[PDB]
């Protein structure tokens, strides 16, 4: 009826630049004014294709992998109270290292719901 889905999209090729520039209109947006009218290219130090062509990538990749693994390695009175020490060996129980692919059982969402509802 009025409220209905699509089941097919609108096709392109029949408006403002599609076949004859829509028969050469004299209407143009402010987003269609000249802007960034000069392509910047890669310089010799950046990653120009002259420099990329002779490079052996596997040796450099293995060296950077080795350096990353080496960096990760080198980084790493009232005695009469009715309840005793309840936390004996709880050394913070690393929930903040775990990452869960579930927006309802994540750690960020449990922190969210703990913070924003009292």
């Amino acid at each position: 009826t009025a409220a209905r889905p699509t089941f097919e999209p609108a096709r392109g090729g029949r408006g403002k630049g599609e076949g004859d520039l829509s028969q050469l209109s004299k209407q143009y947006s402010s987003r269609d004014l000249p802007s960034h009218t000069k392509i910047k290219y890669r310089q010799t130090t950046q990653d120009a294709p002259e420099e990329v062509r002779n490079r052996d990538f596997r040796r450099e990749l293995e060296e950077r992998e080795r350096a990353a693994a080496r960096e990760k390695n080198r980084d790493r009175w009232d005695d009469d109270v009715v309840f005793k020490n309840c936390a004996k060996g709880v050394d913070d129980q690393k929930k903040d290292k775990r990452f869960v692919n579930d927006t309802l059982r994540s750690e960020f969402h449990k922190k969210f719901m703990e913070k924003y509802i009292k």
Partner: protein, 111 residues
């Protein structure tokens, strides 16, 4: 509401579960983003405040049904030794203070 169609092919059922999880993620991340914006005082619409309240109460009741179910499944947390400790401490306190228990509101109570 737990969603199960009795007869349905498992590729269609799995694909629907996949895309429903995707729309769940979009819905929830939009709710987190707009809640952080409403908290910091950023420029927000009034309709996004009402929509965000409506999403947050719905997420809370999903988590609350989860918590009531986990209580009915995982038993008491109270560990009945501790509950006997609580009860007995309260008994010794109330007999320490000579407390008189509150009766039923009487049939001819003057107040």
């Amino acid at each position: 509401i737990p969603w199960k169609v009795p007869g349905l092919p498992t590729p269609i059922e799995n694909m629907i579960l996949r895309y429903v999880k995707a729309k769940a993620d979009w819905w929830t991340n939009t709710a987190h983003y707009n809640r952080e914006r409403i908290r910091r005082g950023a420029t927000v619409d009034k309709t996004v405040c009402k929509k965000n309240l409506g999403r947050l109460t719905r997420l809370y009741l999903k988590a609350e049904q989860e918590r009531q179910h986990n209580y009915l499944k995982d038993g008491p947390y109270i560990t009945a030794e501790e509950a006997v400790a609580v009860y007995t401490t309260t008994v010794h306190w109330l007999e320490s203070r000579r407390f008189s228990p509150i009766p039923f509101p009487p049939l001819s109570y003057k107040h």
